[PDB]
Structure 1
Amino acid sequence: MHQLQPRRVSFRGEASETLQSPGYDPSRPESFFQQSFQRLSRLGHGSYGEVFKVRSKEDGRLYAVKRSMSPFRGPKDRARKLAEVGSHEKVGQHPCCVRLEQAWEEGGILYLQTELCGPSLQQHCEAWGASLPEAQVWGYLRDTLLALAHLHSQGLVHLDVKPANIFLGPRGRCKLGDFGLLVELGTAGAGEVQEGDPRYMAPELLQGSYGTAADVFSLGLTILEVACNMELPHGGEGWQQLRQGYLPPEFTAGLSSELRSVLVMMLEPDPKLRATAEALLALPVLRQ
């Protein structure tokens, strides 16, 4: 038995370049990941695999690397996992999007290497233990809207906007990440489209319908959650009322009229009436 060398995963159609790094010798049994990075800590894990903080031997910089758990079960499993790279490449470089440095597969395992960001917005709020100060909220709302405008004007829908998928950066900035469910509208692959976390899901998705507006609604609930320190319902009347243009006055009494107004625009039940990211970013309140 002999082993295939690791190989880059990319959908850009560029000439197939074969992997190299200081510290890496392809005749050794250790994986490219093992040889090419100093593993520093584990940032996260799940049925998908694990995310590590690492230092690159290529450039001495810190990165995050996501490593799948177990080898591909078959060709379609492999295709579905590799498509995350293709989605992520469609996002390109944007200051409010988590940047993909490179991706590769080895031994049936997929690796995605991104810039290292701060903690997720979920983690931050959990630590904070209270509603975020509204000044913070506005800044996160703006940055995540900038990410969505960037996606949407290219016909891309993220479909899983939520605090766990937004990462902090210095000076109150943040970046949208996790493009594993992102779809390009009106091209091939409509068959492989799947809704995101049901806690944050837009109402139209209940009937199977989606579009860029679904992200605006999910981001609305994201901002509601962090601005009010509210536990979003998983279902029932509470879940349904949030999809019918209603806000619980209890958790939301503290909000400014301006932020309340903006959330109502974002949570509009009819996707055809719902505000676009572009229209929101043009509001004077998001152009300070």
Structure 2
Amino acid sequence: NLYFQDPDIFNRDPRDHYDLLQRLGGGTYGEVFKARDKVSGDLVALKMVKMEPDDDVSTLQKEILILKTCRHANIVAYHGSYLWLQKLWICMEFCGAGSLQDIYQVTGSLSELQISYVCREVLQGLAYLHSQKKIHRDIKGANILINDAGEVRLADFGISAQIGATLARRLSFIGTPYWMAPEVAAVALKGGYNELCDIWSLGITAIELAELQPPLFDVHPLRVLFLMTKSGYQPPRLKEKGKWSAAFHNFIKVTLTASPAARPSATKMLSHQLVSQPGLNRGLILDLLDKLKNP
């Protein structure tokens, strides 16, 4: 729909249009490289995903169309895709400072104002994704990128941006779909039903930026999961008291509401004093980036 706001995939080596520079990272999502446009000199990031020989082109085109229509200032901008020698290459906006986890592992804990600006920017991205009937499902410091201008970008839009190995692992969790009714298959493909899980993850991420680890990081993962099934379950909180304002403690209290029925939406969270206060701008993050270079 052109009323809401050119080829889908090039059958060509992206090295025909870009000079591959340094490897930025890697993992289950594939490998990401910094690159430079041969004509304009503009910098981009290129993600290389290994494809299976039997991956069908019909499904790949449907997946790429989702990347093409899901766009917001607070999500890494998608530019295009290349399919060459069994590798899918996704071209996108370059975020020079890497993830918030890459940064805080050097700088230490963020200030309350720096966290407030990050939360506001992530909530703007989530309000957009939730309006499009998508669920991110992987909000955390390692998945929030920062560019050299101090701007915040979600690394991708989560569930519906998965391709390659990450998507293969999610398909294993879903299991065989041949007996699912269409409405069950819809929830499985979307990655869930309740988008308010993202609001909880943002609350945990605010603690992660304040404390350098999410709550209970040291507890065996299967125990953390089992404790969430118990009737006595209590959500986590900030470890320190006086270091943080009453507005920050309240933001954590309301985002970390165990019952999704009582948890606020992304748009309602954007009205919370913590993220609606004046003085939240990229200058706060330029100060964090300067700390990174001159410690």
Q: 5 Å matches for 1:211-222?
A: 211-222=194-205
1:112-133 deviations in whole A, cap 9, x for unaligned? 01110131111011111x2211
Question: Partners in 1 of 2:266 and 2:273 — Cα distance?
Answer: 14
1:282 to 262, 267, 271: 271
Q: Which residue of 1 aligns with 2:46?
A: 65
Q: How far 1:235 moved relative to its partner? A: 2.3
- TM-score relative to the length of structure 1: 0.73
2:76 aligned residue: 98
Q: Is the 8 A contact 1:216 1:275 kept in 2?
A: yes
- Relative to its length, the structure with more helix (as a share) is 2
1:247 to 236, 239, 247: 236
Question: Are 1:74 and 2:54 matched, yes or no?
Answer: yes
Q: String of CA shifts for 1:221-247, please: whole Å, max 9, x gaps.
A: 111111122344252555666894433
User: Structure 1 stretches of 5 or more lacking a match?
Assistant: 1-14, 20-25, 195-208
Q: Work out the CA distance in 1 between the residues paired with 2:251 and 2:119.
A: 10
Q: C-alpha distance in 2, partners of 1:264/1:86?
A: 38
**Native 8 Å contact 1:166 1:174 kept in 2:** yes
Aligned mates of 1:145, 1:225 — CA distance in 2? 16
TM superposition shift of 1:212 = 1.3
Matches within 5 A, 1:1-150: 16=7, 19=10, 32-69=13-50, 71-75=51-55, 85-92=64-71, 94-117=72-95, 118-128=97-107, 130-150=108-128
1:249 to 1:32, Cα distance in 2 relative to 1, 3 A? closer
Q: Distance in 2 between matches of 1:228 and 1:251?
A: 9
Whole-Å separation in 1 of the counterparts to 2:8 and 2:236:
53
Q: Distance in 2 between matches of 1:252 and 1:90?
A: 43
Say yes or no: does 1:166 pair with 2:155. no
Question: Structure 1 residues 217, 240: closer, same or farther in 2, change over 3 A?
Answer: farther
1:222-237 superposed matches below 5 A: 222-232=205-215, 233=217, 235=221
Please state how far the C-alpha of 1:180 moved relative to its aligned partner. 4.9
State how far apart, in whole Å, the 2-side matches of 1:212 and 1:110 are: 29
- Secondary structure of 1:113's partner? strand
Secondary structure (helix, strand or coil) at the match of 2:159 reads coil
CA distance in 1, matches of 2:9, 2:30: 24
Partners in 2 of 1:237 and 1:72 — Cα distance?
35
Say whether the 8 Å CA contact 2:140–2:205 is kept in structure 1: yes
Percent identity between the aligned chains? 27
Shift of 1:108: 2.0
TM-score calculated relative to the size of structure 2: 0.72
Deviation, structure 1 residue 211: 1.7
Residues in 2 aligned to 1:18 and 1:280: alpha-carbon distance in whole angstroms: 37
Q: What is the root-mean-square deviation of aligned Cα atoms in Å? A: 3.0
Would you say how many aligned residue pairs link Structure 1 and Structure 2? 244
Q: Which residue of 2 aligns with 1:179?
A: 157
Deviation at 1:46, TM superposition (A): 1.8
Distance in 1 (CA, whole Å) between partners of 2:214 and 2:83 is: 38
Structure 2 alignment gaps of length 5 or more: 1-5, 162-182, 278-295
- Write the distance in 2 (CA, Å) between the matches of 1:269 and 1:18: 42
Change (3 A) 1:168 1:241: farther
Q: Is the 8 A contact 1:84 1:181 kept in 2?
A: no
SS at match of 2:68: helix
Contact 1:230 1:251 in 2 (8 A): no
Q: Which one has more relative contact order, counting CA pairs under 8 Å at least 6 apart?
A: 2
Q: 1:265 to 1:189 in 2, by over 3 A?
A: same
Find the residue that maps to 2:239 and give its secondary structure: helix
